[PDB]
Amino acid sequence: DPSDRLVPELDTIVPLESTKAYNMVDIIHSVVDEREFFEIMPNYAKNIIVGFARMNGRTVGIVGNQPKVASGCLDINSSVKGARFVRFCDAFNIPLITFVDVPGFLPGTAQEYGGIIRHGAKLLYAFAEATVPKVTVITRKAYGGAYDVMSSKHLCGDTNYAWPTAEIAVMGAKGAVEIIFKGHENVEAAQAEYIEKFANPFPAAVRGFVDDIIQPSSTRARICCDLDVLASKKVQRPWRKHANIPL
Amino acid sequence: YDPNEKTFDKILVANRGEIACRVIRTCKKMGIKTVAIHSDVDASSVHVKMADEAVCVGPAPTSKSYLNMDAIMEAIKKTRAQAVHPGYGFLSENKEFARCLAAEDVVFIGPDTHAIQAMGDKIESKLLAKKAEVNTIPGFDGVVKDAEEAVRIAREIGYPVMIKASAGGGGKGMRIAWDDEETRDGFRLSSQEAASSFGDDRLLIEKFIDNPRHIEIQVLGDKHGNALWLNERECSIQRRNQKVVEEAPSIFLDAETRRAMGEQAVALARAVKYSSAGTVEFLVDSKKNFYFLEMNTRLQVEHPVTECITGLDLVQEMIRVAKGYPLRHKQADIRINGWAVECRVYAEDPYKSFGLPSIGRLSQYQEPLHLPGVRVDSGIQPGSDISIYYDPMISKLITYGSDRTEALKRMADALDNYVIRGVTHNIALLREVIINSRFVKGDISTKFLSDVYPDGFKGHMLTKSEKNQLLAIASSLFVAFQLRAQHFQENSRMPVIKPDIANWELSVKLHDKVHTVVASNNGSVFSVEVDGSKLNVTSTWNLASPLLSVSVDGTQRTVQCLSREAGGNMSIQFLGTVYKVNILTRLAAELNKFMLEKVTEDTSSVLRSPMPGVVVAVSVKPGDAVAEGQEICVIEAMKMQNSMTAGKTGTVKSVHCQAGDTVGEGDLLVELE
Amino acid sequence: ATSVNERIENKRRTALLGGGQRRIDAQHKRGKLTARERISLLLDPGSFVESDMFVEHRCADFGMAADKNKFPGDSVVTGRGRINGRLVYVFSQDFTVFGGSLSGAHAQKICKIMDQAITVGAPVIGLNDSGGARIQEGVESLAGYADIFLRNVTASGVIPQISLIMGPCAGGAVYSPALTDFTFMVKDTSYLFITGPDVVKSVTNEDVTQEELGGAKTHTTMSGVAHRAFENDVDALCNLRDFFNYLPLSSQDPAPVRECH
Ligand SMILES: CCC(=O)SCCNC(=O)CCNC(=O)[C@H](O)C(C)(C)COP(=O)(O)OP(=O)(O)OC[C@H]1O[C@@H](n2cnc3c(N)ncnc32)[C@H](O)[C@@H]1OP(=O)(O)O
Ligand SMILES: Nc1ncnc2c1ncn2[C@@H]1O[C@H](COP(=O)(O)OP(=O)(O)OP(=O)(O)O)[C@@H](O)[C@H]1O
Ligand SMILES: *C(=O)CCCC[C@@H]1SC[C@@H]2NC(=O)N[C@@H]21
Ligand SMILES: [Mg+2]
């Protein structure tokens, strides 16, 4: 399986409308070698996908959001499921690849009463603690603290990419517009301007928060090249017996 | 292809799919700016990107996207294109579209309105054909009004009776009555759905031809009163009265009968005063007697197969004729060159009624362009999806050769090297058709699939030698995968020592039989003993390529490995048909005998909604005979609508949840058993 | 004659008063102190040394380039001090300035003191009162949160980190307290929730008040997020000093030993 194999089938996989969903497993299968993917916990916390694949013959751990289930929202179960897999992959020198399409964290009274804060902190911890190479591709959505907990550039990530359909924002257009303009009574034009300016991957690009806005066809090739270079990555951290996981 | 002659500056293509791509390609090769139309869904189709300019026309459904006439008028208004080409279907056979475009300034590539109206209804068509001194199918002039009149007419027109519906298409309102009671009740029922189907409420009772061969004649005309016949074509292998495999020359027809049919077609075209490309369809019995039946006032779908034997670009001729120039070729310039055969690749399952339309998205798609004598017409690319709003057409595969056998061999090779992953196609049925003994001999008819597969398409029945070759290839592939699994990189801390196993003893379960296989490797060559029969399989063993070429005992074969599992299951496409095999090691096969075969409850009835939100709509209703794998009750979310599907197969028990249901992390939903 | 001397005094007087006297009074009517009062109560008398006092936020969108939208210090007070003679680094979030919402400069100051603390080997105490990320600021609010999270994770197991929620903390402001070693809340005035009750009603269609969604009682009796709750701010800070007296000053140090009777 050549490392520079193109995947044109991904050029239109993300629907134009933000209301329709897609299967991230199709993206994973297209990107990886021989379309072979060993999924971990395939029937539990299905709004996140974790598994083992191979890129250019090298074992890679893959974590991604599943827009089919819960629209990709993070919750307690998905947070723990992703966190333990990421920690294992870090502990045994396995590169991580992340596919990001996340609207935020699942709301509700049950999530708060169950301690969603602790488990979201678990996933954020696991991603920030990793010293193995990390590659991230944002497909459609990255809103709020969720965007930060999905291996952003700012958690000492290595390479971050955005598809042309990606969008990075503090929060949704409606809430941002209603909170910026409390008493403007011109929500139409304000929302139009906000979605024209900040509903696209350019605000994160101009600040350098993503390396490039890549075409979806080149994804696999790009990733392979990165995994060739970051194979010798070494970082140094302060000494400690161990750390305090938010468990 | 001389660009010196003045030609239309811009043509709007009012179509979609493979024909739009074809006309855009032939316009680009002729140095003409092209403008394409599309719906919202087909915003990234091949023809849109290949065309110079694109115009969105409407929503997804065809009734508001490509059948929306005023949208086409406004599109041509802004685009100010000189001409419009309708391809086939859609608006190619609508008088009022042609009239309204020709009113202001727009020239139409095709026939005139009066010609379409004349050959638009079967009554006038048959009347003028009789006036055109050509052979016509026996029958009663006019349309019968009462069943008593129909059964009275059936007495003197032959005991076999057939009923057809006036106008329309797609083989609707058509069937056969054999008895007087059959005649009367069939006429009553046909009158019953006459209004529902087309609304003409006009029916035809006449004689049914037994063992018919459908033979097409390609006629070309201009505005200077010149008509030519471009040989013939044979379109007989049909299911649901729709052609799938068709051949440029017909072995049945000799020179004299072909000349007679061509002259009759030219005379009919002159009588109707045709001034473009068209096709005239005849039915031929076993006695070389041809009866006229309808002619198409548009480009034919199977036109490319007759271009290879003649070397003429039909769309180029249509464009030049619409410009006004006369034909540059005489009847002596029309000749048969070689042979040509072409098949239609659909997105349908050939194991159900010889094809049932299916939907999906193409994950992988590769066409066999590199093979000799192969041409592909398709508007499909990797990532395209087969919707429910359009024809399930995927591709048209054309092959040409010096004679029939070479064309058939090239077509079989092309079908073996053609990669489609994401949907289900009918390539198995096509490759069975092209290698059938009757088809090779040529004793075919419109009832080919009805009697060749009386019980329906069952797949490919493979002989003992083919079964041995398939088992050998599967075993060699299994061993090659196992051997590739052992090739790590050097560790220098814990060295890896490869196992010294020399012979692999395998148990291979195929269909309902278990075979014992002994496989040995000698580098790039595998010696495989299947039940005491020795075979030698050699290949490059590239396990990542979708197509694998192997050689079994000198016989070259091309197979695909669609699926593979650690448990031994593997699906391999061999000779165009997908076989499922289970390969285990001998020890694992022995141990498998202790595994209790488990029953499946198969009562998934508690599938929940993902989000604790509310419902937005209900897709289905209790008891709608929907099984599994389709929308039941879609959900709304903070952003994304949840395409909630069904559970187990069967008939939906009940749907209770209504739009706007406040749910606490999940929702009881569709129930099956 | 130069006016560069009265500019410093004017900016100092603006910095101490924060978001204005009216907002100080509004904070007081809710039963809450200010950030500087909290710092004064927490630390030893006359030991607080402030850093980044004059820092101003560098956002220039949605009309925040105006003078009226500029507050020196920018909604956080950071520095170092002594508790019973032992060094500590501290930040307190000012709810008066833009609702304590985090911006580029807010995160910059917090990251600065955290870096100093990990360099010398002293703990960090954070008094949290923040409305989330500054919406008008943009994506660099997310960047500041991510920087703070990265420094929280890096320092874990190196220096102790204490969090005390003093007011309503929402949005992404709930993950830094979760990543620290210990977390305390104040009853009836402190909250912790990712999503507010209004959005929950929009989504879950469940009528829940802020107190019963993210209150101190919820997080100390049925959630497992907070470790203890205190009656008011004064009691909370006295208990915080008492608790801080227990911990080793760094992971390189042994467990503290005090005189015993
Ligand atoms: C990273 C993830 C995110 O972006 S979360 C963003 C949403 N955060 C929220 O707190 C929701 C909106 N805020 C509120 O509902 C309440 O003000 C909160 C902060 C929860 C506490 O309630 P309460 O004690 O009544 O405060 P308040 O209504 O008096 O408001 C005072 C001023 O504070 C401001 N504020 C608060 N948060 C932000 C913020 N993230 N961005 C910008 N401004 C914020 C408010 O604008 C408000 O302004 P004003 O002085 O009332 O005119
Ligand atoms: N009179 C007939 N006797 C026997 N078979 C017939 C007869 N008329 C039609 N058929 C069968 O039906 C096929 C086409 O039927 P028909 O002309 O009704 O279909 P259609 O949908 O109008 O087709 P077209 O694409 O030519 O407009 C023929 O190729 C033949 O197989
Ligand atoms: C779609 O989800 C619009 C974005 C709203 C984000 C919601 S609200 C605040 C919570 N914080 C977060 O990261 N997701 C939640
Ligand atoms: Mg017909």
Contact between residue C41 and residue C237 where contact means Cβ atoms under 8 Å apart: yes
| Min Cα–Cα distance to chain C from B609, Å | 13
Distance of CA A222 to the CA centre of its chain: 17
DSSP3 helix / strand / coil % (chain A, rounded to 5): 40, 20, 40
Least CB-CB distance to B641: which of A1, A19, A108? Answer: A19
Residues of A in contact with C157 (CB under 8 A): 240-244
Label residues B651-665 b or e (16+ Cβ within 10 Å = b).
Answer: ebeebebeeebebeb
Instruction: Report how far residue B35's alpha carbon sits from residue B16's, in angstroms, rounded to the nearest whole number.
Output: 12
B638·A8 Cβ contact <8 A: no
Q: Of B115, B107, B52, give the one whose Cα is nearest residue B76.
A: B107
| Min Cα–Cα distance to chain C from A119, Å | 9
Q: Of B257, B306, B300, B248, give the one whose Cα is nearest residue B276.
A: B300
Q: Any idea what DSSP says for residue B539?
A: E
Location of structure tokens 């009004």: B145
Residues of A in contact with C179 (CB under 8 A): 121, 124-125, 246
Q: Of C5, C27, C30, C7, give the one whose Cα is nearest residue C75.
A: C27
> Beta-carbon neighbour count of residue B636 at 10 Å?
18
Residues forming beta bridges with residue B555, ordered by sequence position: B552
Resolution in A: 2.9
Distance of CA B345 to the CA centre of its chain: 4
Which tokens sit at C199? 């959005």
- HSE-CB at B428 with a 13 A cutoff on CA atoms is 22
3-state secondary structure of A13: coil
Instruction: Report how far residue B427's alpha carbon sits from residue A24's, in angstroms, rounded to the nearest whole number.
Output: 29
Distance between Cα C48 and ligand 1 center (Å):
29
Put simply, whether A198 touches C (Cβ < 8 Å) is yes
C204·A155 Cβ contact <8 A: no
In chain C, residues 133-172 whose CB comes closer than 8 Å to chain A: 133, 135-143, 145-147, 149-150, 153-158, 171-172
Phi and psi torsions of B376, nearest 5°: -125, 130
Which tokens sit at C212? 């019963």
Question: Which residues, at least 6 apart from B611, have a Cβ–Cβ distance to it below 8 Å?
Answer: A70, A71, A73, A106, B635, B637, B638, B642, B663, B665, C203
Contact between residue A166 and residue A227 where contact means Cβ atoms under 8 Å apart: no
B382·A8 Cβ contact <8 A: yes
Chains sharing 3 or more CB pairs under 8 A with chain C: A, B
Is B158 known as a binding-site position?
Answer: yes
DSSP labels, B475-516: HHHHHHHHHHTT-----SSS--------EEEEEEEETTEEEE
Contact between residue A68 and residue A22 where contact means Cβ atoms under 8 Å apart: yes
Contact between residue A148 and residue C145 where contact means Cβ atoms under 8 Å apart: yes
Residues forming beta bridges with residue C165, ordered by sequence position: C128, C185
Distance between Cα B346 and ligand 2 center (Å):
20
C204·B638 Cβ contact <8 A: no
Residues of A in contact with B44 (CB under 8 A): 11-12
A155·C138 Cβ contact <8 A: no
Instruction: Report how far residue A246's alpha carbon sits from residue C163's, in angstroms, rounded to the nearest whole number.
Output: 13
Instruction: Report how far residue A247's alpha carbon sits from residue C1's, in angstroms, rounded to the nearest whole number.
Output: 62
In the residue annotation, B294 being an active-site residue is answered as yes
Instruction: Report how far residue C24's alpha carbon sits from residue C27's, in angstroms, rounded to the nearest whole number.
Output: 5
| Min Cα–Cα distance to chain A from B511, Å | 26
Helices (H), A11-143: 24-31, 76-91, 109-114, 116-129
Cα dist from B117 to B72, B95, B96, B98, B114, whole Å: 22, 7, 10, 12, 5
Distance between Cα B161 and ligand 1 center (Å):
82
Marked catalytic residue, from B53, B149, B263, B294: B294
Residues of B in contact with A108 (CB under 8 A): 612, 664-665
Is B505 known as a binding-site position?
Answer: no
DSSP3 helix / strand / coil % (chain B, rounded to 5): 25, 25, 45
Distance between Cα B108 and ligand 4 center (Å):
23
Instruction: Report how far residue B612's alpha carbon sits from residue A110's, in angstroms, rounded to the nearest whole number.
Output: 10
Contact between residue B658 and residue B615 where contact means Cβ atoms under 8 Å apart: yes
Instruction: Report how far residue A205's alpha carbon sits from residue A213's, in angstroms, rounded to the nearest whole number.
Output: 8
Instruction: Report how far residue A158's alpha carbon sits from residue A227's, in angstroms, rounded to the nearest whole number.
Output: 10
Residues of A in contact with C178 (CB under 8 A): 117-118, 120-121, 246
Method in brief: cryo-EM
Kindly report the protein residue whose alpha carbon is nearest to atom 3 of ligand 3.
A172
Cα dist from C202 to A38, C170, C206, C207, whole Å: 38, 17, 8, 10
Measured from the Cα of A147, ligand 3's closest atom is 13
Q: Of A105, A123, A108, give the one whose Cα is nearest residue A50.
A: A123
Amino acid at B335: R
B208 lines ligand 2 (CB under 6 A): yes
Is B17 known as a binding-site position?
Answer: no
CA angle B366, B372, B376 (to 5 degrees): 45
Phi and psi torsions of B586, nearest 5°: -60, -45
Is B95 known as a binding-site position?
Answer: no
How many beta-carbon pairs below 8 A join chains A and B? Answer: 73
> Beta-carbon neighbour count of residue B595 at 10 Å?
7
Residues forming beta bridges with residue B419, ordered by sequence position: B366
Testing ligand 1's pocket by substitution, the residue of C94, C128, C135 carrying the most ligand atoms inside 8 A of its CB is C135
DSSP3 helix / strand / coil % (chain C, rounded to 5): 40, 20, 40
Is B252 known as a binding-site position?
Answer: no
Burial of C26 (0-12, 13-18, 19+ CB in 10 A): middle
Measured between CA atoms, the residue of chain A closest to residue B488 is: A57
Rg (CA), chain B: 29
| Min Cα–Cα distance to chain B from A92, Å | 15
Contact between residue C66 and residue C36 where contact means Cβ atoms under 8 Å apart: no
Euclidean distance between the first and the last CA atom of chain A, given in angstroms as a whole number: 41
* Three-state SS sequence of B100-169: HHHHHCCEECCCCHHHHHHCCCHHHHHHHHHHCCCCECCECCCCCCCHHHHHHHHHHCCCCEEEEECCCC
Is B212 known as a binding-site position?
Answer: yes
Return the residue in C62, C119, C142 with the most chain A beta carbons within 10 A, the one to mutate for interface testing: C142
C153·A125 Cβ contact <8 A: yes
B383·A20 Cβ contact <8 A: no
DSSP labels, A182-238: SS-S-HHHHHHHHHHHSSSSHHHHHTTSSSEE--GGGHHHHHHHHHHHGGG------
Which tokens sit at B246? 């068709």
C144 lines ligand 1 (CB under 6 A): no
A117·C145 Cβ contact <8 A: no
Q: How many helices (H) and strands (E) does chain C have?
A: 10, 9
Ligand nearest to the CA of C75: 1
> Beta-carbon neighbour count of residue C220 at 10 Å?
18
> Beta-carbon neighbour count of residue A229 at 10 Å?
11
Cα dist from A34 to A3, B182, C37, whole Å: 11, 59, 63
CA angle B323, B327, B328 (to 5 degrees): 115
> Beta-carbon neighbour count of residue B648 at 10 Å?
17
* E strand or H helix that includes residue C35: helix C35-42
Distance between Cα B188 and ligand 4 center (Å):
23
Least CB-CB distance to A120: which of C143, C158, C175? Answer: C175
Q: Any idea what DSSP says for residue B290?
A: E
Ligand nearest to the CA of B283: 2
Which tokens sit at B25? 């390609």
Kindly report the protein residue whose alpha carbon is nearest to atom 29 of ligand 1.
C99
Question: Which residues, at least 6 apart from B423, have a Cβ–Cβ distance to it below 8 Å?
Answer: B347, B358, B359, B360, B361, B362, B386, B394
| Min Cα–Cα distance to chain B from C202, Å | 9
Q: Of B55, B19, B64, give the one whose Cα is nearest residue B37.
A: B55
In this structure, chain C runs to a length of 261
Chains sharing 3 or more CB pairs under 8 A with chain B: A, C
Instruction: Report how far residue C72's alpha carbon sits from residue C62's, in angstroms, rounded to the nearest whole number.
Output: 19
A203·C155 Cβ contact <8 A: no
Is B211 known as a binding-site position?
Answer: yes
Phi and psi torsions of C212, nearest 5°: -85, -5
